[PDB]
Design a protein around this ligand. Structure first.
Ligand SMILES: *Cc1cc2c(cc1C)nc1c(=O)[nH]c(=O)nc-1n2C[C@H](O)[C@H](O)[C@H](O)COP(=O)(O)OP(=O)(O)OC[C@H]1O[C@@H](n2cnc3c(N)ncnc32)[C@H](O)[C@@H]1O
Ligand SMILES: [Cl-]
Length: 381
């Protein structure tokens, strides 16, 4: 019989940040998650996530990234959990053969961000361990880095509960019942109501937004990462090896320096198996590609980090058709906020999105420019 101000469905990356923002302002909040956040069934585990600022995917992403960065620095000062390490982030690819690299360089020029430009052997000289062809060029952002995602979520969750937020774990929301002046969620453990609703179920948005009369294409992808025994004298954060996102002949890869001897972590971005969140196989290696794709890159570009596989993890991307996020009010219900399809690049923005989501649920508007994320745009189809 407890009526909330706001109910958040899915307390993951976006959800929990949104809950922290709401609780911090005294808004009576209930956060309902299918599991017990942070956990390893969604897309926030794997320990680390890259945060970059020269976002060539859209000028609106830059301010969002820059504001999110400031929010991560604030979070770092408020909790005892480790939030961010300034490893810096390196981007490289074939000179003149990478829209990604070129768009990154343009974004940095356009937004006056601080970056170092280098190419060929300069890359290989600056960062021992990296071996690229002399025809490769790179842009290095020294002030961006790595976020410890599980710590971020755990910190947001602890800060929000200390301010009165309620978290209902291991409870799957099955249906929604929206009325012009209140929202209701349906779960096996009971029904709950509030004045506002935030929906951020990650991969599961591809299966439950239909319950909100929304028919938006969202395709979940199985995306693995691998930790490899590496030459600590080259790939250790301690010796300044950077976080990275690069473009090679067969696609985009991303990785992290070895932290405390955990080994270099790498992930293949351009490819992932299409799956259903409820049946995805979360065992690293069940497929031969899981590991072969990562070693194909390592043996060629960072041969010193191609050692024994120390650890594997399986996580999910949820793509929209244009691969841009969806952050907006529900087209038929102004008391419902949607956050979905972060298509593999949304964690860095989660602190900012948390702010956008709390602004939208409380006022129906946000001070951030989120036009390219409209739920009514045509590219969504
Ligand atoms: C998978 C992946 C993603 C990724 C990455 C590497 C890999 C292997 N590297 C990134 C990087 O370097 N930088 C970056 O900015 N992003 C990177 N990503 C993407 C990022 O992790 C994702 O975009 C982000 O985590 C998406 O967050 P979202 O909040 O959408 O998803 P979630 O964290 O999975 O949380 C969803 C929660 O909702 C709950 N749930 C699901 N269904 C229900 C129902 N029915 N009822 C209630 N709760 C539900 C989940 O349990 C989950 O907690
Ligand atoms: Cl995603």
């Amino acid at each position: 019989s407890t009526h909330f101000d706001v109910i958040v469905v899915g307390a993951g990356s976006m959800g929990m940040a949104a809950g922290y923002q709401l609780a911090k302002q005294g808004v009576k909040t209930l956060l309902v998650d299918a599991f017990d956040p942070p956990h390893t069934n969604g897309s926030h585990h794997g320990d680390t996530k890259i945060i970059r600022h020269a976002y060539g995917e859209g000028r609106e992403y830059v301010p969002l990234a820059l504001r999110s960065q400031e929010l991560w620095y604030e979070l770092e000062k408020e909790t005892h959990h480790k939030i961010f390490t300034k490893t810096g982030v390196l981007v490289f690819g074939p000179k003149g053969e990478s829209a990604f690299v070129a768009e990154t360089m343009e974004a940095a020029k356009e937004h006056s961000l601080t970056v170092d430009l280098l190419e060929g052997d300069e890359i290989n000289k600056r960062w021992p361990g990296i071996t690229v062809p002399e025809n490769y060029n790179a842009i290095f952002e020294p002030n961006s880095g790595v976020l410890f995602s599980e710590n971020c979520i755990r910190a947001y969750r602890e800060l929000a509960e200390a301010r009165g937020a309620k978290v209902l774990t291991h409870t799957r929301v099955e249906d929604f019942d929206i009325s012009p002046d209140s929202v209701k969620i349906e779960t096996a453990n009971g029904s709950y109501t509030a004045d506002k609703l935030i929906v951020s179920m990650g991969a599961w948005n591809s299966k439950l937004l239909s319950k909100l009369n929304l028919d938006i294409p969202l395709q979940p992808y199985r995306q693995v990462v691998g930790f490899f025994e590496s030459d600590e004298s080259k790939y250790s954060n301690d010796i300044d090896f950077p976080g990275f996102m690069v473009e090679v002949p067969n696609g985009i890869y991303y990785g992290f320096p070895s932290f405390g001897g955990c080994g270099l972590k790498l992930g293949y971005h351009t490819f992932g198996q299409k799956i259903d969140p409820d049946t995805i196989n979360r065992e690293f290696g069940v497929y031969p590609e899981d590991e072969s794709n990562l070693r194909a890159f390592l043996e060629e570009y960072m041969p010193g980090a191609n050692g024994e596989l120390k650890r594997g993890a399986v996580c999910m991307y949820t793509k929209t058709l244009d691969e841009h996020f969806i952050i907006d009010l529900h087209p038929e219900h102004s008391n419902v906020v949607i956050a979905a399809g972060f298509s593999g690049h949304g964690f860095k923005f989660s602190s900012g999105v948390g702010e956008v989501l709390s602004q939208l649920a409380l006022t129906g508007k946000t001070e951030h420019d989120i036009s390219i994320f409209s739920i009514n745009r045509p590219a969504l189809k």
